[PDB]
Amino acid sequence: PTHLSVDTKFKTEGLCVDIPGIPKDMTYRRLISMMGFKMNYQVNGYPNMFITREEAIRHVRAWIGFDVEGCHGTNLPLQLGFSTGVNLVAVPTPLMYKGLPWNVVRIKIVQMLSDTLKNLSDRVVFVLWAHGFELTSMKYFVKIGPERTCCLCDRRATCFSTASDTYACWHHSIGFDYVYNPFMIDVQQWGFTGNLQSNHDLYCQVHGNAHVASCDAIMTRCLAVHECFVKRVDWTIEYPIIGDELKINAACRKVQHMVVKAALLADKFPVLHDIGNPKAIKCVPQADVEWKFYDAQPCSDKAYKIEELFYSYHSDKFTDGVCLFWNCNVDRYPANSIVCRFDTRVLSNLNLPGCDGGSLYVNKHAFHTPAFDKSAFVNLKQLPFFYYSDSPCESHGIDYVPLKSATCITRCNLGGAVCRHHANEYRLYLDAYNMMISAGFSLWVYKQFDTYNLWNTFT
Ligand SMILES: COc1ccc2[nH]cc(CN(C)C)c2c1
Ligand SMILES: [Zn+2]
Ligand SMILES: [Zn+2]
Ligand SMILES: [Zn+2]
């Protein structure tokens, strides 16, 4: 059970309005043949054009919703819509382009897919709600054959050039005109009742239907994301490294230790309530405080209601001490909290568009995160940058320039002059802090938090 067999059945009911008379008995093999393609009994790494739900999940970063709406079928012009918000018009002779022949439209499709997927995936997965036109229009922009490598690098081939007879990946396809060996999945095969809008609108209110091909392409990918990442959650799937994944995770650990440690020194809470990751360890292991853990898995649909996390009768008195919500999304945080909430609006290679305002954050694992809402932090304020260190001033073992900063809470800075060791550690921590903030994370803390209370922790 590795790939989707070509001898698997394909439900043709959704295709009979664009293709009337389509036989009820259909296999993927017969479908691909009908689409104008020949697999020629090729055991060269491309066993089927269509892929399984399991394979689609592993290749989520390659997902591009695709829809084709007839404007007027070799006689009539077609509207090609993609989840990128692009709308191209092909002639046979919400960015809306005018009518142009297939030879020029295929060039634009290559450029668009390459600019979208070069820093995301090694392929493309056309996410369909197949009705006919999208499948029968693929022979005009897709070429297939054995698995190949790029003519300028070692990545797999994703494009083909009829001008130079060569193959390229998304990084080196400038001037390329055919999509080489794409993948696709028909969401309609998963067994649904009713049309795309009825199913999409059951879960999402952010994507509307404007009756343009790209709106359907958007609702299609959004629905597929809901079914595989919102209602069904598999955190055992590993995702390859494509960016600053390691620096981001490392920074999150350094920032959490710093924030939680300084908070316990400034206000000296008797007890900390650790609400979140059931696998969690104390982020500040040498703290005087009482560490109480409460298990909560990452919510993928709606943010937890603070009433169901705390009430229904644990210290029970969460009001005593401080609550720590590190990536645990709740509707409204109590006033005595320390919070790290991911901002779903962040633009990055790790963050993919989500369902109902949420985003799919892919860093080692896929986490669909509910929509960012600034009203959840009414009882808190944003946590400002600060660097704290009780460690001794001792350099050990990189060229220096004296550091002058009001946010370097150290004994040397208290004494008037920042030592080389704390200036080195401050600059590194500020880099990790900036890395984390830029990745989309947001820090919030109780209103009474004041870094001025850290200066007397050295006497
Ligand atoms: C710790 O961060 C990551 C992020 C993405 C990753 N993909 C593969 C690995 C390897 N890991 C299992 C050690 C990974 C780690
Ligand atoms: Zn290449
Ligand atoms: Zn949606
Ligand atoms: Zn120092």
UniProtKB/Swiss-Prot annotation:
The active site is at 67, 69, 134, 211, 216. Mg(2+) 2 binds at residues 69, 211, 216. Zn(2+) 14 binds at residues 150, 153, 169, 172. Zn(2+) 16 binds at residues 393, 412, 419, 422. It is found in: Host cytoplasm; Host endoplasmic reticulum. Residues 355-369 are annotated as: GpppA-binding. Mg(2+) 1 binds at residues 67, 134. Residues 49-230 form the ExoN domain. S-adenosyl-L-methionine binds at residues 274-280. Zn(2+) 15 binds at residues 200, 204, 207, 222. Inhibited by Remdesivir antiviral drug (GS-5734). It catalyses: a 5'-end (5'-triphosphoguanosine)-ribonucleoside in mRNA + S-adenosyl-L-methionine = a 5'-end (N(7)-methyl 5'-triphosphoguanosine)-ribonucleoside in mRNA + S-adenosyl-L-homocysteine. It comes from the Viruses. Residues 239-459 form the N7-MTase domain. Coiled coil: none annotated. Interacts (via N-terminus) with DDX1. Interacts with nsp10. Plays a role in viral RNA synthesis through two distinct activities. The N7-guanine methyltransferase activity plays a role in the formation of the cap structure GpppA-RNA. The proofreading exoribonuclease reduces the sensitivity of the virus to RNA mutagens during replication. This activity acts on both ssRNA and dsRNA in a 3'-5' direction. This is Guanine-N7 methyltransferase nsp14. The lineage of its organism: Viruses, Riboviria, Orthornavirae, Pisuviricota, Pisoniviricetes. The chain holds residues 5949 to 6449 of 7096 of the full protein.
